[PDB]
Nucleic acid binder design. Structure first.
Lengths: 381, 381, 51
RNA sequence: AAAAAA
RNA sequence: AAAAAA
RNA sequence: AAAAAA
């Protein structure tokens, strides 16, 4: 009686994150500078030419690590006026000091851009291995009207933000899926259809986003800044806050799914005592998921320290049950790979059979809600 | 017991929109100016000649993007006195700065309008490819009496506001349907019957409204301003607030419909455990639909970020069930296309059969409301 | 059980008219004058001849 | 994203 | 770590 | 003191 109250407080502080008082500057990463080219002026011509040079900058093999990181941050912030104030607002990272150099257009330079310095600029910005748009009839995207820039910018960013959904979880599998989101934005007339980048260009970005952590911290934390914008967003932000729904819980699909099929379906095989403790583990992780705040759905994009805590190994039987339930109830979850060292297939087939036995077997915990008679429950069977 | 209370709070903040505190001017779109010609004076003669020049301005192939946007905003606000104060009241858009130039009539100009500047004006305003009224006996609509203008203005606006209903959802299918609303307003004597524009004129507007977002934000947000007008509206506003009923939830017909046929019919195949969680997903989206306020029904006209949340993919089984129910119960919903990658036809035919089995099978949850006997329920069968 | 209470509030605000706070003189129609002849005096003879 | 709605 | 989601 | 846990 007093054991169960002591047990409930024992389990919730075991999952509870340690309260981060802080070490007063003790643990600080050594910072490497990242060269972020930001347009010098508000005019469209500069934004357009910098977007032209940064897109082909990324494709070449020659570019190093943080040169590719700053070129990506260079175009993930071209949609705002004053991109320099956007970067310093977002970078709460300890490992990275962003030094950001303004880029103004020029007449004398080979690339057409100088730094606000004409040969150091082209040394920054500069045939089968070069990545580009997949229809090679387009050589230069430099445009003049700003809505022609704003459509050619979202066509580039909607092919980079969709990579973040499936960069840490399924890089190999991913190329099949981001073409479906490309059909979504082409048919919505959000993006321009002929400017689809090569898979070779995107494999440079996708193996970059998967590799470094400092780019995934920037990309998550600006999405969390896009989401906070009060009014109607600018039309690139209202697209970046459209792609994010594919990134929200991108890798918690052994926990989000278990809750969806184990807990919520409420088959009578939850009153097993074998599950009676792994519900109490899982009711704490549901309470923990808003204790983590709004950075909770991105805890495996960001590689947070407590995505080990939402792992299915702490509830391996109730996970396998909700694997068994969700194979029949989804034609999509048949494509889900779930192979782990704690799989327990005995439970999985017990959870498969609960779906099959109760096929036309209208419940008792939702029939009193409606008033289902024995006359009515036979008609469903 | 305490699991289900933790589960209910876990599901409602998962759907809950992030509270928009704001980034303090961090994310601001680069603004392109849009040339909006507004009549210089209150007199009818100017309004009439500007409406004449803006209607033929739209038809020609030569007009660019935002020149077509400002010409449309130029005529979507001719019905008010002081159209300049209407535009600044509505444009809460970050992507668009409306600069609006007054237009006064002239004797010396070729078009007949100057800017309050005689050659820059006709350079703004100016044979098979030109779009016009479908009966070519009418060349000029310039009229003098103001009720002859107010009827020739509503005849133009009731052919543009009906495009917004089916511009983002069914542009190809749409031309069959807006002729039915044209019969509605002709038989109500709301519009003048001989001034029907070409489909070639309307295809310029419909492929414009579908393309840009900044025109759909203006058209929605003034409808929300028409709706707020306290007394009896002016007779164009009482027509724009008549067309809007065709635009309210124009594209949520996988959610509005599911609720109408899945939830509300209350067949005994809702006590399935396969649906018992997708009711709780769908009871949050019903609570979310007024948490979004009065801009909720337009969330797919405006391409809001959380029309992915009312998508049927989060409840794909209970959607397919309400697809199965609604095919028999409507001779209209047989024309509904519902083809998605999450369709699950097993459920669809389970929802088709619940309509067919309970044909003459008066319920138990509404018979106690009336007092239906076994004598009376046999008479319905 | 709590679905039906959420359903009943969902259907009544869908039909509910939007509360007309007002746009503060933003949407005003252009007014055309209408000539209304009204009798000058209370006497019956004028009312009769105007009718 | 899709139907119908004086 | 893996699926699907206008 | 013993296992497993992206």
């Amino acid at each position: 009686a007093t054991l169960l109250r002591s047990l409930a407080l024992f389990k919730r502080n075991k999952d509870k994150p340690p309260i981060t008082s802080g070490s007063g500057g003790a643990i600080r990463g050594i910072k490497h500078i990242i060269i972020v080219p930001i347009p010098g002026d508000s005019s469209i011509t500069t934004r357009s030419r910098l977007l032209d040079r940064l897109v082909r900058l990324i494709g070449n093999p020659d570019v190093s690590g943080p040169k590719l990181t700053g070129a990506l941050i260079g175009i993930l912030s071209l949609f705002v006026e004053s991109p320099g104030q956007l970067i310093q607002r977002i970078t709460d990272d300890p490992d990275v000091s962003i030094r950001l150099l303004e880029v103004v257009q020029s007449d004398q330079s080979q690339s057409g851009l100088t730094f606000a310095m004409e040969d150091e600029a082209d040394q920054y910005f500069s045939q089968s291995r070069f990545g580009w748009f997949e229809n090679k009839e387009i050589s230069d995207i430099e445009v003049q009207d700003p809505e022609g820039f704003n459509m050619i910018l979202g066509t580039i960013l909607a092919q980079i933000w969709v990579l973040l959904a499936k960069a840490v979880t399924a890089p190999d599998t991913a190329a099949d899926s981001e073409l479906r989101r490309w059909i979504k934005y082409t048919q919505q007339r959000r993006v321009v259809g002929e400017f689809r980048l090569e898979r070779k260009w995107l494999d440079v970005v996708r193996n970059r986003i998967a590799e470094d952590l400092s780019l995934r911290r920037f990309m998550v934390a600006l999405i969390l800044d896009i989401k906070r914008t009060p009014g109607n967003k600018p039309r690139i932000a209202e697209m970046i806050c459209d792609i994010d729904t594919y990134i929200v819980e991108a890798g918690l699909a052994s926990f989000i799914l278990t809750i969806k099929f184990g807990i919520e379906t409420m088959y009578p095989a939850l009153g097993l005592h074998e599950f009676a403790g792994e519900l109490s583990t899982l009711e704490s992780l549901m309470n923990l998921y808003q204790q983590m705040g709004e950075t909770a759905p991105y805890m495996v994009i960001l590689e947070n320290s407590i995505q080990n805590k939402f792992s299915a190994g702490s509830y391996p039987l109730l996970w396998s049950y909700a694997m068994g339930v969700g194979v029949e109830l989804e034609n999509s979850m048949g494509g889900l790979n779930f192979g782990r060292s704690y799989f327990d297939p005995a439970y999985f087939r017990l959870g498969q059979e609960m779906v099959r036995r109760s096929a036309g077997k209208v419940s008792s915990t939702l029939a009193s809600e409606l008033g289902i008679t024995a006359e009515d429950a036979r008609l469903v069977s």
